[PDB]
């Protein structure tokens, strides 16, 4: 779930959990159609990953637990330790989404916007 994502995020970068919380349209894990920029485009990929996690496999990405190992290199962040497909799958969604966060840049005014913006 999102406690581990928040932790995967703290593992990779120092940007406090709040700043992603209600950022843009999708962050963190909310539905819309048009993402404001690329940071918000990560969350859509994340959200679209959770949607696939639920439909194909049977996961419950927002409730379920998974484990991950924090290594020195962000890309080294490990998910192989998970004993089930479902638990392995969601751990990757968050892994993918958290690395993608590291690429994109943080435009403050896109955080906590109006619903008329999305």
């Amino acid at each position: 779930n999102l406690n581990q994502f928040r932790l995967m995020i703290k593992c990779t970068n120092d940007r406090v959990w709040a700043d992603f919380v209600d950022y843009g349209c999708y962050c963190v894990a909310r539905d819309s159609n048009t993402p404001v920029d690329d940071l918000d485009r990560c969350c859509q990929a994340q959200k679209q990953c959770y949607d696939e996690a639920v439909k194909v496999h049977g996961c419950k990405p927002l409730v379920m637990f998974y484990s991950f190992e924090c290594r020195y290199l962000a890309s080294d962040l490990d998910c192989s330790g998970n004993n089930t497909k479902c638990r392995n799958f969601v751990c990757n969604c968050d892994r993918t989404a958290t690395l993608c966060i590291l690429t994109a840049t943080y435009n403050r005014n896109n955080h906590k916007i109006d619903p008329s913006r999305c």
């Binding site: 932790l7 703290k10 593992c11 990779t12 970068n13 120092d14 190992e69 924090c70 290594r71 020195y72 290199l73 962000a74």
Partner: protein, 60 residues
């Protein structure tokens, strides 16, 4: 690469090379710094005198 690579190294728990003293180390499972008793075994650099110093260098 956000925190040094020694941050992910286990402290010398329970090892005595002298006086044991209050120290702090980065826990790579909690992803924060934690108290421990350090006994002067300079095995690695994952031991700080202050929790905050540890939380600056190693927290991110």
């Amino acid at each position: 690469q956000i925190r040094p690579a020694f941050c992910y190294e286990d402290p010398p728990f329970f090892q005595k090379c002298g006086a044991f003293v209050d120290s702090y180390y980065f826990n790579r499972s909690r992803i924060t710094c934690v108290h421990f008793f350090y006994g002067q075994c300079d095995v690695n650099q994952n031991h700080f005198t202050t929790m905050s110093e540890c939380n600056r260098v190693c927290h991110g």
